[PDB]
Copies of this chain bind each other. A is one copy, B any other.
Amino acid sequence: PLKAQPKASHFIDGDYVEDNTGTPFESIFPATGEMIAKLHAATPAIVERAIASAKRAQKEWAAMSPMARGRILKRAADIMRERNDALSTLETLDTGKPIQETIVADPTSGADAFEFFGGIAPSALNGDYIPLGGDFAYTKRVPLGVCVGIGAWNYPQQIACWKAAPALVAGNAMVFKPSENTPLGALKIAEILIEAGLPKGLFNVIQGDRDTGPLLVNHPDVAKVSLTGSVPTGRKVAAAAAGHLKHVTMELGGKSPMIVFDDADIESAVGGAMLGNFYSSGQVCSNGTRVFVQKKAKARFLENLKRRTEAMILGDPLDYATHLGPLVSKAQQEKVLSYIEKGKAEGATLITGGGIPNNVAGEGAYVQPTVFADVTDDMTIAREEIFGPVMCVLDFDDEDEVLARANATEFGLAGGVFTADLARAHRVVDGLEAGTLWINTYNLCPVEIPFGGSKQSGFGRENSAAALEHYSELKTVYVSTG
């Protein structure tokens, strides 16, 4: 009688659907190692069924007005709000992330995308009338067809909604495959959508295998792939999809730089770093941020950070007082502690953290929130991206120096700057090679603004009206008048 057993592994054509011949896997609650659900990865028949059901549904959806489609999405967001407590608790069970975070940042933000896209479509989906001096043309923003979304394990509900909302509003159908790690929230989204009046088949969810992603991505009836994941998955998925001439968009992560100048609001800069590395998860902070502090602020910065970091309550993520939950496995705890020692060995200064805590216990696998300072570029810790509560603080003296250093990365997801100086703020943001920058704050992704990266962090944007360019294409109709 498992804690979060869904009715079946998949949700296809308006109801729960099982195939118990698919690779079995379990959803595990990190804190207790308790098994909360037993699932099966899609079989090939489950894949063909999800895509065929999407393809069949889609044409009627595309013929409806934007406003009509928009209304269903708005009703879904409303239901999601009614259900925020259960959806967020389910997210905490599935991810291990603190409820206090989950209840404001995860499903709510997913609801925000359904609500935003549902409201802007009746204007943002308009094309052009183009006068040509006798003749004229018009352009229509038409859906691509059947889209595939591949999710990752960081804020899984938010990821599913951010892909589903612009895809559906634009007139597409979507088959969505959540991460094997976090299979449960996407099914609720699918169920909610039907209760909101979305026709069956328009948003189908199937669990996955190592085999599942490649069957969806190479399928002849799929027009478009959207992926959130790691670079090596992204490269493989982008080559396969493009090789079939499918549209592709992805967000691939990458530690981003946060730069704090002498004249920063210190307490503000500290909250930003803490968000980016500790309480921090979700799309941008999943993997950590590199914090650069200017010399004359180093000392106020470390001391406010030490104090606050040590105030953090570690514990059961289902409890509202917890700031930081345990890690996914003991193997993670290991990995994070060698990393720590690798840093102590390198010569970086330990500000706070470094060990297994007491007393929080039990039964989770915890690491104290930990700070390294006097970190330098060459250091193994600075170089290797990690999942865990560890902050690397690098010193710098000059603006040109840090820009150079901050930019010398493969990735270009995000970055921010703390300065009180007008000129400096806009300059540093202009010089940073990243998709999304913050001035005097960090990690805020309101659905009104575009989200995505540069360079090896992938392409395309989620949120804002701009997301729709990825889920539609222009059809042009030239009208001979004579």
Interface residues of A (CB under 8 A from B): 128, 130, 132, 135, 137, 139-140, 231, 234-236, 238-245, 247-248, 250, 252, 268, 426, 429-430, 434-441, 444, 446, 448-452, 454-456, 458-459, 461, 464, 466, 469, 473-480
State whether A476 and B450 are in contact (beta carbons under 8 Å apart), knowing that A241-B242, A242-B242 are contacts in the complex. yes
Shortest CB-to-CB span from A233 to chain B, Å, is 12
Chain B residues near A245 (CB, 8 Å)?
Answer: 231, 234-235, 238, 250, 252, 455-456, 458-459
Question: Measured between alpha carbons, how far is A328 from B149 in the docked complex, in Å?
Answer: 46
Contact A478–B456 (Cβ < 8 Å): no
Cβ–Cβ contact B448 & A130, under 8 A = yes
Output the least CB separation between A48 and chain B (Å). 20
CB contact under 8 A between A429 and B477, given known A137-B449, A240-B239, A245-B252: yes
Q: Are B459 and A476 in contact (CB under 8 A)?
A: no
Q: CB within 8 A of A450: which of B139, B450, B458, B479?
A: B139
| Residues from chain B with Cβ under 8 Å of A456 in the complex | 245
Q: Is the CB of A475 within 8 A of B434?
A: yes
Q: How far is the CB of A443 from chain B (nearest CB, A)?
A: 10
Chain B residues in 8 Å Cβ range of A234: 245
**What B residues does A449 contact at CB under 8 A?**
130, 132, 137, 139, 476, 478
CB distance from A285 to the nearest CB of B (A): 14
A464 with B130, Cβ < 8 A, contacts A436-B478, A478-B449 known: yes
- Give Cα A234–Cα B429 distance, bound, in whole angstroms: 36
- When the two chains form their complex, are residues A478 and B132 in contact, meaning their CB atoms are under 8 A apart? no
Given contacts A132-B446, A458-B245, A459-B473, contact A439 B479 (CB under 8 A): yes
Contact partner of A238 (CB less than 8 A), chosen from B128, B243, B435, B451, is B243
Q: How far is the CB of A266 from chain B (nearest CB, A)?
A: 15
- 24 A-B residue pairs with Cβ-Cβ distance under 8 Å, sorted by A, are A128-B464, A130-B464, A139-B449, A139-B450, A139-B464, A238-B242, A245-B455, A245-B459, A247-B459, A434-B475, A435-B473, A435-B475, A437-B476, A438-B478, A439-B480, A440-B479, A441-B478, A444-B478, A444-B480, A454-B473, A461-B473, A461-B474, A466-B474, A469-B469
Given A239-B242, A241-B242, verify A439-B248 contact (CB < 8 Å). Answer: no
The majority secondary structure among interface residues of chain A is mixed
CB of A422, distance to nearest CB on chain B (Å) = 11
User: Which chain B positions have C-beta within 8 A of A140?
Assistant: 430
A451–B435 CB distance below 8 A: no
For A241, the chain B residues whose CB sits under 8 A away are 242
Tell me the complex Cα distance, A436–B475, Å: 6
Partner of A474, one of B268, B439, B450: B450
Instruction: Kindly state the separation between the CA atoms of A14 and B480 in the bound complex, as whole angstroms.
Output: 43
Bound: A236/B242 CA distance, A? 9
Residues in B with CB closer than 8 Å to A268 are 480
A248: B residues at CB distance < 8 A: 242
Q: Are A477 and B439 in contact (CB under 8 A)?
A: yes
CA distance A269 to B236 in the complex (A): 47
- CB-based nearest B residue for A457: B245
**CB nearest to A139 among chain B residues:** B450
Q: When chains A and B are docked, how far (Å) is the Cα of A474 from the Cα of B436?
A: 9
Expressed in whole angstroms, the minimum distance between the Cβ of A271 and any Cβ of chain B is: 11
> Are A239 and B247 in contact (CB-based, < 8 A)?
no
Interchain nearest-CB distance for A416 vs B (Å): 8
5 A-B pairs with least C-beta separation: A242-B242, A239-B243, A441-B480, A238-B242, A440-B480
* Smallest CB gap from A136: residue in B: B449
Known: A238-B245, A242-B242, A464-B130. A476 touches B451 (CB 8 A): yes
Residues on the B chain within 8 Å of A435, using CB: 473-476
Contacts A130-B464, A235-B245, A245-B238 given; indicate if A439 touches B475 (C-beta within 8 A): no
Query: A448 vs B140: C-alpha distance in the bound complex, in angstroms?
Result: 15
Shortest distance in angstroms between A47's beta carbon and chain B's nearest beta carbon?
Answer: 21
Cross-chain contact B240 with A244 (CB below 8 angstroms): no
Identify the closest chain B residue to A247 (Cβ). Answer: B459
In the complex the two chains form, what is the Cα distance from A434 to B250 in whole Å?
25
Known: A128-B464, A440-B480. 9 other contacts (CB 8 A): A234-B245, A238-B242, A242-B242, A247-B459, A435-B473, A436-B477, A437-B476, A439-B480, A469-B469
In the bound assembly, the distance between CA atoms of A430 and B234 in angstroms comes to: 35
- Closest-by-CB residue of B relative to A416 is B478
Minimum CB–CB distance from A148 to chain B (whole Å) comes to 15
CB nearest neighbor in B for A474: B450
